[PDB]
Amino acid sequence: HPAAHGVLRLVMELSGEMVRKCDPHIGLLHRGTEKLIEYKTYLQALPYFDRLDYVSMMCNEQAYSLAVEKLLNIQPPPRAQWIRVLFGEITRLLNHIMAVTTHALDIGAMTPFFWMFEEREKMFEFYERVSGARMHAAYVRPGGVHQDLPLGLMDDIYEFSKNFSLRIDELEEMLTNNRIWRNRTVDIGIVTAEDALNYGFSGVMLRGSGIQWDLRKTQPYDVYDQVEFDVPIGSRGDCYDRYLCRVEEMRQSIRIISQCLNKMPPGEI
Amino acid sequence: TYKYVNLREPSMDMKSVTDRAAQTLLWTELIRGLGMTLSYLFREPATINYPFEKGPLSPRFRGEHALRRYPSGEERCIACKLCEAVCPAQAITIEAEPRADGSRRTTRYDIDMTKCIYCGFCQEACPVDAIVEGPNFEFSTETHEELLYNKEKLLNNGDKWEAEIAANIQADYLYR
Amino acid sequence: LVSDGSSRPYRCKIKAPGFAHLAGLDKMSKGHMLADVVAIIGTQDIVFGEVDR
Amino acid sequence: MMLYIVFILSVIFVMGFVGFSSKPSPIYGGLGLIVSGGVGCGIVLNFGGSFLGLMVFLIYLGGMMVVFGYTTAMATEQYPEIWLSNKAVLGAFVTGLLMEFFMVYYVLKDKEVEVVFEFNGLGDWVIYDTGDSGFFSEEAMGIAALYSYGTWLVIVTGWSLLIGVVVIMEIT
Amino acid sequence: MFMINILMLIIPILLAVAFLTLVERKVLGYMQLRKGPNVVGPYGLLQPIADAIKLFIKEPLRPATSSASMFILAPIMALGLALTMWIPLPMPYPLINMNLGVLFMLAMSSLAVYSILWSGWASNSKYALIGALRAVAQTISYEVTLAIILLSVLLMSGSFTLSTLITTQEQMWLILPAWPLAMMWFISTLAETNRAPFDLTEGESELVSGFNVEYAAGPFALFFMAEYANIIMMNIFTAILFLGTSHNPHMPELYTINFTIKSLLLTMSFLWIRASYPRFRYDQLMHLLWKNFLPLTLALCMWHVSLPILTSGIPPQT
Amino acid sequence: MNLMLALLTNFTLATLLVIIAFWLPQLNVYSEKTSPYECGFDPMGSARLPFSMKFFLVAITFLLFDLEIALLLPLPWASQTANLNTMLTMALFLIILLAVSLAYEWTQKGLE
Amino acid sequence: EYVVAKLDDLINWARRSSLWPMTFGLACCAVEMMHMAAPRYDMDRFGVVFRASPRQSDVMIVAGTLTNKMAPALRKVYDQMPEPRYVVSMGSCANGGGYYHYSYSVVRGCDRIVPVDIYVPGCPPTAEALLYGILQLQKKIKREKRLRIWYR
Amino acid sequence: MELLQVLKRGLQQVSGHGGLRGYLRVLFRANDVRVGTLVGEDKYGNKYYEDNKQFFGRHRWVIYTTEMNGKNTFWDVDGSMVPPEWHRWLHCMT
Ligand SMILES: CCCCCCCCCCCCCCCCCC(=O)OC[C@H](COP(=O)(O)OCCN)OC(=O)CCCCCCCCCCCCCCCCC
Ligand SMILES: CCCCCCCCCCCCCCCCCC(=O)OC[C@H](COP(=O)(O)OCCN)OC(=O)CCCCCCCCCCCCCCCCC
Ligand code: SF4
Ligand code: SF4
Ligand code: SF4
């Protein structure tokens, strides 16, 4: 059961109680990818970037479509990008609705799952109305967005966003200061070292641990520069200060989706 | 910029520390939410009662395939061998050969329905605008000897509803 | 992304976390119980098929 | 449900033992006890003593034995075969079982045989009560609570236990 | 017809433990925002006749590696000491009148955990082996929290029998006076019988499935019907030992009516929790008993001892 | 005489119901292959159960706190007496003899 | 005579009305399984309670992609299940493998490994053509255990 | 107070819906027993009620009756039966 929507087999030699050893075996899902993307053209081979992870969809392909426009010396037109912030920063509301919950289904609770996925649905429409499909949707391309969005969605994004900061307040009174949870996580798995850098970790389990750096405001993407946000940071390197980024990082997004509905200029795609 | 979270210090004065010793020992928290935020059951359930009621969709949906034909029928496909050549999965298989009059058409056209990854790359390459992903999730038969399709399975499966299809494109075709 | 100057690519090498955030389990957890190691993983957000890296 | 329902318990009790009084692979040792302990607490619940019977369940049979059974996973025996395992246990059994039986056979199979087994009569429970009585909590062990007269009996037992842990805090 | 008063008990209860399993997921359904088993009923009330029949049709494998002599005498219990314990339990008229019987529960509360140690050992290796060992260890350390805080109040009522315990709670719902204790009477039975917040024995999170793992549909109805024959009894007890009803030598019937509208509220508590709280990680699980729960329970005992003596209160019994 | 009528009644429904579940389809004509595929998801598992101590003490540690709360049991019968001071002065000793026996060991539980 | 064929309006209505599906998360398709047990389309309480242990199940479900190293695991698990078992694949990768069908390290098709019954077709089947793939399997018990004992 | 308030809709949901006959029969098909406001024409035996626009997603619903095309009678209902027109209606595509 504790596979976390995946498949792994790990083996530990524990000393009577304490683990003191672990050495997992990954490689259960390999599928043979990068041998098969030498054999497909550029626009034909796009989805096999969408199907890589299951959760973030338009945030992949934002990282391929930006690695091609370069070699081509070409930029999207202005109404391109200001989409790719609205979907690009709406799926950060997905992996942060999952990793607070389907993590905490292991801790054993029920409702913080059956309570949320009522909502993670109301988002999946917005992948279906814009283009086609339930999850994996191939929309971004090397040229900016595929095709324009219908007449609508801007009364279904606005109406949906102003409701949302409440549900994220039903994952707070239900978690933060609930003791039996605070005690399941504090000072647990603390890596505070400069090995937590030396390994070359990415964002959170960084930014929640002190050392302070992010690739959204130290490098521009696609006009990301023109909106204001603050990058939450943690105190001590344990887990329960890598959780507390992922609440205060769902309460930053609703700033940008709210800041990015006002600016989208008319133009081609 | 920044923020700092979980950086705070207890106050340490006897007006406070009762408030944290009226908590551990009397359970004044931990009944706050799950004495309550759980119930809070009194909201109407949300369920789509399935065999009858069904849920939303959009005109751009993807699904079971079809091949249209104009008014009095031409088998709109001209066998230009494209919807075959953009196909990522390589499901499509096409064999033309000149029809009796001399207008060209197909013979074998087979979409495998296991390999097809549901792009929307074969709806968007056909210049004569034949092959079209239907909006019907009718599927699920019991033998893999089946889902492979021939030509003359498709046409029917695309003449069973053309009142569904012919009224979607004329919502959607003004965008692309 | 290498590219050889013509239509089909050459190596396209993807890296996502899962070669770091799980390179560091064995390190991180030595000295806590077994019933922690279930709740350590969940914080890295390890999700697989991505480790197709 | 005759007058012999006492004599039928003990001779099950006496047979409760010889199971584990030979050599049974001591995960079945317990099952030679909790039967014996059970029937044992059975016999005592006649005669009128009750509270003192229903304790053996609580303090010993229920509470103690589980420790005897919570180990024999630490000393854990090998999975050779167990029980009927080695061909030796069976030989020692019956000669015990018959030895009361052949005793119980002609102990009294007749008028009397002979003297030493003949001064025990049977069947009315001749002694098993006397007359009638009044009531105090019952009469007998109904009053087993003396924190009155008994004191120097408790305060040794009270103190002798307190050292039980110190000894065992060490060698552990 | 004393034999038809018994068999009128064993049978009519196996319907509750059956139809609890339905109200399991209706009540726990609307915590989630949804409806409960619905399609089959029409209301669902017909679900459990279909579920009782799928198991015993479904083939009952035994592990090739097991010791069959233990793989029977153990479950041939999980259904006795669950159905025996019900015997002397006044509602209002208990089937048996046991002089000191209150003590008799602990006799049968103590002798069930010696049916866990058999089964998990009876079968095989480390998911039910050391996995049925260390649910022994927590199950016996939540007695000392118990027998004391059961023994406390009994200073406040005079004897060991249950016919007195209706008399003393007359117009005083025995939960006022010791409300500190009553809490700990609750977290115990919820910790001892392996229910939601301390869940470990039956596995979901900490392991695959505790102690149930081997039994296929055949025997595993018994346990899944045994484990719910304890839970509705301790909770059909607590409310004879705390929230008392008012006997009525005339309309006995109105005693039970108002009695099941309490014990049946009370129970719907182990379901109202399970939606809510997470688990304890077996260290914290015992580590919170000695340090934390226990010191009080002794301390209060030094208190309910003196409070009668220091008020000329001493309750009228032997 | 009616208790044993209320006990052997109870088991005989239970000791019945094993056979009508375990045994009845057990002789059914289905396949039931003897392959050593059983003992789920730890396929082989060849070892002795090693001694692991902090498993052990939690046995002993209880057994002794257990005894005296049999000694402690006849308080509520003993609350009815002649001279009662020999009770309160004495009754309160056992408890403190119990609670002391904690405080010592409490320096080392280890991981319990 | 006729009692048998009326008896199978019980036993063939019991096994179809309570199912204890295992699931295999492996790949993308697992998430559109979850949303079947989320409250929108509510899987449980329509008669099918969600995941249990390997031993207690009836209908296992294959999502996801089956590489080489996962085959030795599945075929073992499919066995241990009790009698009245089925296998319902779903997703375009248990049907002949989505894409990856030409790869080196993907088994092609997952019918090859087990006797599969019902199929469903597409990256993620839309969380709908799932349930309408089961209301095939609750209608795929029209079978009778009569007419094996009672004809031959 | 709340005992007779909501209750006056259900007793008119029963006694004014098919009496006893046209109630237990629409409940045994499913627990959908709520009687929508309007009706619909199409097509063979299968109605469409449609609710008052007081819900979203459970507002638009359907009814199956009997033996469409070479078909088992009733308690077999799958959901591929709807006429290939309503896919432009019942699915809320338009
Ligand atoms: C003069 C007369 C006498 C005057 C006395 C004055 C009042 C004294 C009486 C107070 C005694 C009340 C009960 C005893 C105290 C409660 C038990 C307790 O101490 O819990 C301590 C527990 C330890 O937690 P902690 O020390 O913080 O360590 C973890 C750090 N991560 O911290 C905790 O919070 C643990 C919480 C409980 C753990 C389980 C909770 C699970 C949910 C069950 C709740 C349901 C029970 C509600 C009661 C229902 C009653 C019908
Ligand atoms: C697996 C299949 C094979 C096993 C099948 C048989 C299994 C039997 C298991 C026995 C388990 C229950 C035994 C518990 C004994 C409890 C007896 C008891 O506590 O009764 C209380 C009562 C006290 O008497 P009191 O109320 O104070 O005075 C009344 C004045 N009118 O006492 C009385 O009223 C008088 C006592 C009358 C009863 C006679 C003695 C009965 C006890 C014999 C038990 C034999 C042990 C069996 C094995 C036990 C293993 C656990
Ligand atoms: S539809 Fe377009 S692509 Fe498919 S065959 Fe006819 S012409 Fe070639
Ligand atoms: S549907 Fe998707 S996969 Fe099937 S052919 Fe058209 S594009 Fe290639
Ligand atoms: S096809 Fe089904 S399984 Fe293969 S990847 Fe797409 S979703 Fe995951």
Domains of chain A: 10-269 (1.10.645.10)
Write the DSSP symbol of residue D58: I
Which token pair is B50? Answer: 């399935």
Q: Please, what is the end-to-end C-alpha distance for chain F in angstroms?
A: 47
> How much distance in Å is there from the Cα of E314 to the middle of ligand 5?
75
> How much distance in Å is there from the Cα of B165 to the middle of ligand 4?
18
Q: For ligand 2, atom 3, name the residue with the nearest CA.
A: F11
Provide the β-strand partners of residue C30: C32
In 3D space, the residue among E89, E102, E91 whose CA is nearest the CA of residue E154 turns out to be E102
Q: Helical H runs in chain G?
A: 3-7, 11-17, 31-37, 71-80, 131-134
Write the DSSP symbol of residue D77: P
Q: Which residues in chain B have their CB less than 8 angstroms from residue E33's CB?
A: 43, 45-46
CA distance E169 to E183: 18
| B103 Cβ contact partners less than 8 Å away, ≥ 6 residues apart | none
Q: Which residues in chain H have their CB less than 8 angstroms from residue G135's CB?
A: 78-79
Q: Which of residues 46-85 of E touch F (CB under 8 A)?
A: 55-61, 63-65, 72, 75-77, 79-80, 83-84
CA distance F18 to A100: 45
For residue A133, how many other CB atoms are within 10 A of its CB? 24
Work out the angle between the directed axes of helices D154-169 and F53-71 (0-180°, nearest 10). Answer: 170
| A120 Cβ contact partners less than 8 Å away, ≥ 6 residues apart | A94, A97, A98, G35, G38
* Contact by Cβ (8 Å): H45, H66: yes
How far apart, in Å, are the Cα atoms of A103 and each of A3, A89, A97, H39?
Answer: 10, 21, 10, 47
Angle CA(D66)–CA(D69)–CA(D73) in degrees, nearest 5?
140
Q: Which residue shows structure tokens 């595509």?
A: H93
CA distance C38 to A104: 11
* G115 → chain B, closest CA residue: B143
Q: Tell me the residue type at H89.
A: W
* C50 → chain G, closest CA residue: G27
In 3D space, the residue among B136, B146, B147 whose CA is nearest the CA of residue B114 turns out to be B147
> Which CB contacts under 8 angstroms, 24+ apart, belong to E232-237?
E232/E16, E232/E17, E232/E20, E232/E267, E233/E82, E233/E85, E233/E86, E233/E89, E234/E189, E234/E193, E235/E189, E235/E263, E235/E266, E235/E267, E235/E269, E235/E270, E236/E89, E236/E263, E236/E267, E237/E89, E237/E105
CA distance B52 to B54: 6
For residue B89, which ligand has an atom nearest its CA? 4
From B68, B69, B80, give the residue whose CB has the most ligand 3 atoms within 8 Å, as the site to mutate: B80
Which token pair is A168? Answer: 């994220």
Q: Please, what is the end-to-end C-alpha distance for chain A in angstroms?
A: 45
Asked if residue G90 has its Cβ within 6 Å of ligand 5, the reply is no
Whether C contacts B, i.e. 3 or more CB pairs less than 8 A apart, is no
How far apart, in Å, are the Cα atoms of G129 and each of B63, B65, B136, F101, G122?
Answer: 11, 15, 10, 66, 9
Write the DSSP symbol of residue H20: T
Provide the β-strand partners of residue G19: G48
Q: Is E242 exposed, middle or buried (0-12, 13-18, 19+ CB in 10 A)?
A: buried
Annotated binding site of G for [4Fe-4S] cluster: 28-29, 93, 123
CA distance F2 to E255: 26
- What are chain D's domains? 4-169 (1.20.120.1200)
Number of Cα atoms under 13 Å in the Cβ half of residue B42: 4
CA distance A233 to A245: 7
Which token pair is G95? Answer: 């049907």
How far apart, in Å, are the Cα atoms of E31 and each of D133, E34, G2, G65?
Answer: 62, 8, 47, 35
Q: Which of residues 2-21 of E touch F (CB under 8 A)?
A: 2-3, 6-7, 10
* Contact by Cβ (8 Å): G76, G39: no
In 3D space, the residue among B54, B68, B70 whose CA is nearest the CA of residue H86 turns out to be B54
How far apart, in Å, are the Cα atoms of H27 and each of H14, H20, H55?
Answer: 11, 11, 20
CA distance D143 to F89: 20
Write the DSSP symbol of residue B45: P
Is domain F7-107 classified as CATH 1.10.4160.10? Answer: no
Report CA dihedral (G55, G58, G60, G61) to the nearest 10 degrees: -140
> How much distance in Å is there from the Cα of D53 to the middle of ligand 3?
92
Question: Resolution reached, in Å?
Answer: 5.0
Residue B130 lies in domain: 64-175
Q: Is A145 exposed, middle or buried (0-12, 13-18, 19+ CB in 10 A)?
A: buried
Q: B7: distance to nearest CA of chain A, Å?
A: 6
- Does C32 contact E at CB distance below 8 Å? no
Going by their DSSP bridges, the two strands G59-62 and B131-133 should be labelled as: unpaired
How far apart, in Å, are the Cα atoms of C38 and each of A191, B125, E111?
Answer: 17, 48, 34
Cis peptide bond upstream of D114, omega within 30:
yes
- Region for E271 from its dihedrals, namely left if φ exceeds 0, alpha if ψ lies in -120 to 50, beta otherwise: alpha
CA distance G42 to B49: 9
Q: H9: distance to nearest CA of chain B, Å?
A: 17
Asked if residue E187 has its Cβ within 6 Å of ligand 1, the reply is yes
Cis peptide bond upstream of F25, omega within 30:
no
CA distance D56 to D43: 12
Going by their DSSP bridges, the two strands B65-67 and B131-133 should be labelled as: antiparallel
Considering CB atoms only, which of G17, G45, G58 is closest to E50? G17
How far apart, in Å, are the Cα atoms of H85 and each of B169, F8, H62, H63, H82?
Answer: 15, 68, 13, 15, 8
CA distance A248 to A171: 12
Asked if residue B122 has its Cβ within 6 Å of ligand 4, the reply is yes
For residue B81, which ligand has an atom nearest its CA? 3
DSSP sequence for chain E: -HHHHHHHHHHHHHHHHHHHHHHHHHHHHHTSSS--S-TTSSSSTTHHHHHHHHHTTS-----TTS-TTHHHHTTTTTTTHHHHTTTT--SSS-SS--SSTHHHHHHHHHSSTTTHHHHHHHH-STTTSTTTTTTHHHHHHTTHHHHHHHHHHTTTT-SS-SSHHHHTTGGGTTTSTTHHHHHHHHHHHHHHTT-SSS--SS-SSSSS-TTTSS--HHHHHHHHHHHHHHHHHHTTTHHHHSS-----SS-SHHHHHHHHHHHHHHSTTHHHHHTT-----THHHHTTIIIIIHHHHHHHHHHHTHHHHTTT---S--
Q: Which of residues 79-98 of B touch A (CB under 8 A)?
A: 86-88
Considering the domain G1-152 in this protein, what is its CATH number?
A: 3.40.50.12280
Which token pair is A124? Answer: 């999946």
CATH number at residue B168: 3.30.70.3270
In 3D space, the residue among E24, E30, A95 whose CA is nearest the CA of residue G42 turns out to be E30
* Contact by Cβ (8 Å): E192, E146: yes
Number of Cα atoms under 13 Å in the Cβ half of residue E176: 6
- Three-class secondary structure of residue A264 per DSSP: coil
Residue-wise burial string across F53-91, b where 16 or more C-beta atoms lie within 10 A, e elsewhere:
eebbbbbebbbbbbbbbeebbebbbbbbeeebebbeebb
Going by their DSSP bridges, the two strands G86-89 and G59-62 should be labelled as: parallel
CA distance A217 to B1: 9
Angle CA(G119)–CA(G122)–CA(G123) in degrees, nearest 5?
130
CA distance E186 to E198: 13
Return the H-helix or E-strand segment holding G88.
strand G86-89
Question: Under an 8 A CB cutoff, do B53 and H87 touch?
Answer: no
- Does E278 contact A at CB distance below 8 Å? yes
CA distance E25 to A173: 24
How far apart, in Å, are the Cα atoms of D121 and each of D10, D13, D108, D114, D127?
Answer: 16, 21, 9, 12, 11
HEC profile of E140-154: HHCCHHHHHHHHHHC
CA distance G94 to G88: 9
Q: Tell me the residue type at E314.
A: I
* Contact by Cβ (8 Å): F102, D95: no
C-alpha B67: how far from chain center? 20
Q: D47: distance to nearest CA of chain E, Å?
A: 15
- Three-class secondary structure of residue A188 per DSSP: coil
Technique used to solve these coordinates: cryo-EM
- Three-class secondary structure of residue H60 per DSSP: strand
CA distance C39 to A103: 8
Question: Under an 8 A CB cutoff, do B6 and A178 touch?
Answer: no
CA distance E70 to F80: 48
Which token pair is F102? Answer: 């904690």
- Region for E12 from its dihedrals, namely left if φ exceeds 0, alpha if ψ lies in -120 to 50, beta otherwise: alpha
> How much distance in Å is there from the Cα of E174 to the middle of ligand 1?
20
| G119 Cβ contact partners less than 8 Å away, ≥ 6 residues apart | B140, B141, B142, B144, B147, G88, G89, G90, G94, G95, G133
Which token pair is B32? Answer: 């706050």
Q: Which residues in chain D have their CB less than 8 angstroms from residue E69's CB?
A: 83
